[PDB]
Task: inverse folding
């Protein structure tokens, strides 16, 4: 098949240029992103029940939806959390690789089945299903330049919604805009004391608002069916809704025949404000707003980010002068840096292989061929990667950088073999190509197939590991497939074409090049003699080799496991949790001190702070901070995120109002709110809330005292004092007070009631009624409220309600339908996560019967990964065995070659242990590609060894000669791969942890597979063919 | 009207016309909410009746 | 009986604003007439199955439903396929041509 | 020859699809603003007669 | 027009726009691919020209 192309070079040239042209024509549609959708597809339900307690919302709304979403296709689990703020959060997680559109529509279908049961308040407010985790491209923020504290965030938010959000959501590529704040709304702050003075109840003001602020579909006179006479139809356009606070204050509450009237403004203060005050956002000590922009599926990131930034800057021209925009977080900058570095490593590795190519062959034309055949393979790799719908993310760029090595060998060995024949027989380029390719082509097919099937299994595994290995392994595999195809067809034509004849006997050379030829001749002869010296002693080398494999196993089992190394993402998590029952103002003061201290830190460029939200849970006492770090180029190691987190935790260790905790972000977005382990403490039997909290303190005492874990804290809101209202229903009724009046009055005065729609200049926002700030600040204010009796007088609440304090849940957490506690933490440094999981299982076994435990997200996927790795390795090994017996027409030769991989594993294990990296996915793939290189090396020795030993050469002589004439390309490709991946292990900056975990593992494994493999492989050959007594 | 004048006067096109309904006279109903209320008339009654 | 502007800012505006960001949008046209019929046409790129377009638009109308007036809801919102392979139109008419 | 080809290729007016005789037509009946259905029916009567 | 009044194309005009955009590099890709197949078949470049 190669000879077909040697006789017809243009055919091979055209095929290669064809695949290259395809590659070029496929980039302009490349999808790019930080990482692929490694996190599972999560759908999240947001139901709002204003003024409903945590338990009320738990048993009234979220429980019903939870009941309905059971049994959905592709469920993985589902978490719910009901906060005292009246927002219910339900996160339904599915297996990764499932289309999020189908998950979304199925969840909407089940939400509809549930919809008949939620209260009227939630329904009129609306239930929202979206995608909490996705390729959130960036977050853009608006803030006030002057840093005025009295800044009305509501006007800023209204400007953002009317002018900015619509434009950005209009942009190409963006699949969802998440405005992370409230919306304008006419607020009706009623004063119940004025209502008392005027003999008015809160239901009266609500009904006045409801009937007087309504649009009027009046119609048009002269309408069809019209008289045969009239001819002038026209619209009636009655004005019914009210536009500004002045109009709303003119709503008549009670008007007499004489003319006296009671208008709403006389009892309530009317203004336009936030529909909801649960959440507040601050950016660098100034009241700010922000939105989360998420990338649509199958779209470029860099183009989308540039479009968003250009659009936003264009809008900044029309911005109010007091307000300014800035984009603190951008997930496309990481990819731009990543591809710009990977392209640099690719070019600089091409230059290194060119340099050593020319150092060995001392002629440029010989060296040129691989430099043309390689990028052809890379372009084909892009085309096929796009065809299956993979994305250009960091992991495919590592597919690139560590493909380049295994890909380059095909050209290296082919051109180096053609040179060896050209030198030792001196034929013309064409017949020399015929001879060399006839020697090597069957071996090349064996290579292509065997590495195809060595990274084929890595594509079978499921989970988030499943996605990582999918992309990275399949990029590798497509690379090697096209590399083998080129070595079969195109590169031999390249040798037959570009190579120039050499004079006979021109081994004498001028300059240091002649020194090189002499010294490599000496090295090859010395190694030849070395083989000749060890091949008689094969049984004795067994003991060294077995020491090597045993050491491999020993430090491999001593190697702590890990999922993914934590990367410096340039941002941190700081949690602001105050004691139970903390007002927003205390949290704002704590956030003020925190943000000031972050100003004092030079490692931080901008600090974005959220009030009312924290990964522990949403509430008034809770807040979160996302400091943004400076660019890596402008920072050193001493200002790394971990060191800065330690600095903050030490600084705010003696904070007097609440707790401040700095946690580095989880390595994989969407798999959790922090790294480490996630455990849900269930109550599979219904022991009760108090019993569940008892089990919670039990497990936390048994865990935090165990030095195996760094920490473990309830990722959730602590129980808070509550004010139960003891309403004597009988007493209230006797005074003529309906329970409906009390319930309505309490709901509207303290929980705020949304009455009807405010038609705010084209936007349908909701008028909200709530009691005055001064009239709802104390428990006595609850009693001072009045309700109407049947006789028309107003009854004070204190006449029939006595307030008794008790303690209750501010946040209720349920998992797979049962009440649960969310306990999270990280293991002690230098301690494996699997051992911590085992310790946690052991401790949870000591819990009282009925308390279940369940892993979630990161822990569950670590579990399935650790489960799958073993039979993954087994299937890989058995398939390579089968392909080897296919190619070698033997069994002894297959075991002979398969003896090679423990040396590469030993190299990788020793290198990673010396640098101390864990057994992450990146090291695992580095190991498998090192194994692939070692296998390529072993074949490159043994196919020629078999060829000689079938030609009449003695077993020892055949092996030694085979090693002699395969020594040069062996160390050749070894050094090329060395210097190509050395930048990976020394990588610093964005994504550097992954690149280093690659580089060290690959460098060490391939270092051993070369230094130890080249000596041991002929020894293995002679042993296996002797002990089994194989015959040619 | 600006663009339509700039276009219909330009001989490059047969015509340009709003594929849409022209503005029509309307009959606003000025309801004195205060007056109606004093006579004892709710806005709900007026809105429902109309 | 709702005017053009009333229907504009009360019904078609809310559905219009909410259907943005739907997958495969090419644009969307809305027109509100004094007759009380709101008309919104959402166009997708050719080659997309209109079943998926229809279901996504129904799911978005669902999110919109919470805001429409009671009159529209009791009368009901309808989504269909304005352009398709309309095979024919068939008609019934009176032979005698009576106007009454 | 190739230059001539280019010269009348760039002189060739573009089009999407030629209009086919589909056997039907569009006639629009728009009356002044505020027109009752009966005026439109009279206009349609005269149109249909013609 | 006064600043603030945007214009957009719809339906037929939008499709005509994208068609006029794509025609050129469509022709180009066709020509380069036929050239490549022709050099493949003829084992030459001169014959393809
Ligand atoms: C800066 C600001 C927000 C960030 C988020 C948003 N979070 C998810 C949605 N809920 C709000 C918090 C995620 C990750 C990094 C960030 C960095």
Result:
């Amino acid at each position: 098949m190669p000879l077909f192309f040697i006789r017809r070079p243009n055919f091979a040239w055209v095929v290669a240029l064809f695949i290259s042209l395809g590659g070029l024509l496929v980039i302009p549609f490349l999808p790019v992103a930080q990482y692929p959708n490694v996190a599972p597809p999560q759908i999240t339900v947001t139901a709002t029940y204003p003024g409903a307690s945590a338990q009320v919302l738990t048993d009234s709304v979220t429980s019903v939806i939870e009941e309905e979403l059971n049994g959905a296709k592709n469920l993985l689990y589902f978490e719910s959390t009901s906060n005292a703020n009246g927002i219910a959060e339900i996160t339904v997680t599915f297996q990764p690789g499932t289309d999020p559109e189908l998950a979304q529509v199925d969840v909407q279908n089940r939400l509809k089945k549930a919809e008949a049961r939620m209260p009227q308040a939630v329904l009129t407010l609306g239930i929202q299903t979206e995608q909490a985790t996705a390729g959130f491209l960036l977050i853009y923020s608006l803030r006030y330049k002057d840093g005025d504290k009295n800044a009305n965030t509501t006007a800023l938010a209204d400007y953002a919604v009317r002018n900015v959000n619509n434009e950005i959501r209009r942009l190409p590529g963006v699949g969802k805009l998440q405005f992370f704040d409230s919306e304008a709304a006419m607020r009706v702050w009623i004063d119940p004391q004025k209502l008392v003075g005027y003999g008015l109840s809160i239901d009266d003001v609500n009904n006045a608002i409801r009937t007087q602020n309504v649009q009027v579909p009046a119609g048009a006179f002269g309408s069809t069916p019209g008289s045969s006479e009239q001819e002038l139809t026209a619209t009636l356009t009655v004005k019914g809704t009210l536009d500004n606070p002045e109009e709303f204050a003119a709503i008549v509450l009670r008007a007499n025949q004489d003319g006296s009237r009671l208008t709403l403004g006389d009892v309530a203060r009317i203004e336009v404000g936030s529909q909801d005050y649960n959440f507040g956002s601050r950016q660098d000590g100034k009241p700010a707003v922000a939105a989360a922009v998420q990338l649509s599926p199958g779209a470029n990131a860099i183009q989308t980010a540039e479009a968003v930034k250009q659009r936003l800057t264009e809008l900044s021209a029309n911005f109010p002068d007091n307000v300014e925009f800035s984009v603190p977080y951008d997930t496309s900058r990481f990819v731009d840096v990543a591809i710009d570095k990977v392209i640099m490593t690719l070019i600089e590795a091409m230059v290194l292989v060119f340099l050593v190519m020319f150092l060995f062959l001392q002629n440029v034309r010989y060296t040129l061929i691989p430099s043309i055949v390689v990028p052809v393979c890379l372009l084909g790799t892009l085309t096929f990667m796009y065809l299956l719908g993979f994305s250009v993310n960091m992991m495919t760029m590592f597919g690139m950088v560590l493909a380049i090595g295994i890909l380059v060998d095909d050209a290296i060995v082919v051109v180096e073999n053609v040179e060896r024949i050209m030198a030792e027989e001196g034929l013309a380029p064409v017949p020399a190509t015929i001879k060399a390719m006839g020697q090597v082509s069957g071996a090349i097919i064996g290579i292509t197939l065997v590495l195809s099937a060595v990274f084929l299994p890595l594509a079978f595994m499921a989970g988030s590991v499943g996605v990582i290995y999918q992309q990275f392994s399949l990029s590798l595999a497509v690379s090697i497939l096209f590399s083998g195809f080129l070595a079969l067809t195109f590169t031999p034509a390249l040798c037959a074409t570009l190579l120039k004849p050499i004079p006979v006997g021109h081994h004498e050379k001028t300059g240091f090049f002649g020194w090189f030829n002499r010294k490599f001749t000496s090295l090859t002869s010395r190694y030849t003699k070395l083989n000749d010296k060890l091949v008689p002693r094969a049984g004795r080398v067994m003991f060294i080799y077995l020491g090597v494999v045993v050491l491999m196993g020993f430090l491999y089992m001593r190697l702590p496991e890990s999922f993914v190394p934590v990367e410096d993402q340039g941002y941190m998590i700081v949690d602001i949790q105050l004691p139970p029952g903390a007002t927003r103002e205390r949290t704002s003061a704590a956030g003020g001190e925190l943000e000031s201290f972050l100003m004092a830190r030079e490692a931080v460029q901008t600090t974005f702070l959220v009030l009312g939200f924290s990964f522990s849970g949403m509430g008034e006492n809770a807040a979160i901070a996302f400091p943004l770090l400076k660019d890596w180029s402008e920072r050193d190691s001493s200002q790394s995120p971990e060191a800065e987190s330690a600095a903050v935790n030490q600084h705010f260790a003696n904070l007097d109002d609440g707790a401040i905790m700095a946690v580095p972000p989880p390595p994989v977005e969407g798999l959790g709110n922090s790294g480490g382990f996630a455990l849900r403490l269930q109550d599979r039997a219904g022991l009760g809330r108090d019993a569940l909290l008892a089990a919670r303190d039990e497990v936390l005492g048994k865990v935090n005292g165990n030095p195996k874990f760094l920490y473990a804290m309830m990722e959730g809101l602590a129980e808070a004092p509550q004010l139960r209202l003891v309403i004597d229903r009988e007493q209230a009724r006797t005074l003529g007070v309906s329970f409906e009046a009390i319930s309505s009055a309490l709901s509207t005065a303290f929980g705020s009631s949304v009455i009807n729609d405010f038609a705010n200049a084209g936007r349908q926002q909701r008028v909200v009624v709530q009691a005055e700030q001064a009239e709802r600040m104390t428990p006595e204010s609850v009693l001072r409220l009045h309700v109407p009796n049947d006789s028309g007088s107003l009854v004070p609440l204190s006449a029939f309600v006595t307030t008794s304090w008790e303690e209750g849940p501010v946040q209720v957490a349920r998992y797979n339908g049962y009440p649960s506690i969310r306990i999270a933490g990280d293991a002690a440094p230098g301690v494996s996560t699997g051992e911590a999981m085992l310790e946690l299982e052991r401790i949870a076994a000591e819990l009282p019967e009925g308390i279940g435990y369940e892993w979630t997200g990161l822990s569950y996927q670590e579990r399935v990964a650790s489960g799958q790795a073993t039979m993954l390795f087994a299937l890989a090994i058995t398939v390579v065995f089968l392909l080897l017996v296919a190619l070698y027409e033997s069994w002894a030769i297959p075991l002979t070659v398969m003896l090679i991989v423990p040396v590469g594993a030993l190299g990788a294990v020793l290198a990673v242990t010396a640098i101390g990296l864990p057994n992450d996915v990146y090291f695992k793939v580095g190991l498998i590609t090192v194994i692939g290189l070692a296998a390529k090396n072993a074949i490159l020795i043994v196919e020629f060894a078999k060829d000689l030993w079938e030609d009449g050469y003695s077993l020892r002589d055949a092996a030694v000669e085979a090693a002699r004439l395969r020594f040069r390309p062996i160390i050749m490709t070894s050094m090329a791969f060395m210097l190509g991946v050395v930048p990976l292990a020394i990588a610093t900056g964005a994504g550097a942890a992954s690149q280093r975990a690659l580089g060290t593992g690959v460098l060490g494994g391939m270092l051993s597979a070369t230094m130890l493999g080249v000596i041991f492989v002929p020894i293995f050959f002679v042993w296996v063919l002797s002990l089994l007594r194989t015959k040619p």
Remarks:
- The pocket of 1-(naphthalen-1-ylmethyl)piperazine is lined by residues A 139, 292, 329, 571, 608, 626 (CB under 6 Å).
- Chain B touches chain A at residues 24-29, 31, 33-34, 37-40, 42-44, 46-47, 50 (CB under 8 Å).
- DSSP finds three helices and no strands in chain B.
- The radius of gyration of chain B is 22 Å.
